[PDB]
């Protein structure tokens, strides 16, 4: 089937100057092979029309954002860059082709700037994510006492269409990502032998503890972007982009 429960994650494979992203819902004038690189005051977004230009690193367009990014936890979705404004709980939708801020949204009650980071720290309080069902934001609040909160976002206007309060402490996991409507978290032990240790199914409200091995090289709050179009995990560890294959039940 197209979707299912995560049962296996492959070994990370290093992909041959900054974190880059592709659109899982490519929208004309862009195509599947359009790439965007965030140069890491993170404010420049470099746009490459072709994979050749991207690998033969010559950009086709440079965007200047109206404000800098809090972190690399941004996504490109349906022609827009969605990101968190520095030193804020504000998510911004920046339409890339028109260079227009189409929407801004305060994530209500969200902690930011070192309140609810992942276990390895950094300004990772708030993460944007994309899956088969659309656009998400992962965060926490004082109301939720540091438990991971997730909200499905309307990609047009950034309204919170639905919110779930999960039963896992955000600061106790190294990372999190959403596949087929299920939130998965990555453990934070000491070895490179991490695990996908928890799942929360937003379709049912059912959560459980898992033991899926997840290879991780550095004790660093990596930028993980699941790409539902490729059905692969993409991750940036401040040094390289890597891809994890997956298998769904
Ligand atoms: Na992420």
From Swiss-Prot:
Changing residue 220 to C: No effect on protein stability. The chain holds residues 243 to 502 of 504 of the full protein. Changing residue 127 to N: In GLC1A; uncertain significance. Changing residue 107 to N: In GLC1A; uncertain significance. Changing residue 224 to N: In GLC1A; induces stress fiber formation in only 5% of cells. Changing residue 242 to I: In GLC1A; uncertain significance. It comes from the Eukaryota. It is found in: Secreted. Residues 2-249 form the Olfactomedin-like domain. Ca(2+) binds at residues 127, 175-176, 224-225. This is Myocilin, C-terminal fragment. Changing residue 172 to P: Decreases protein stability. Changing residue 100 to I: In GLC1A; likely benign; no significant effect on protein stability. Disulfide bonds join 3-180. The gene is MYOC. Changing residue 180 to R: In GLC1A; severe form. Changing residue 246 to S: In GLC1A; uncertain significance.
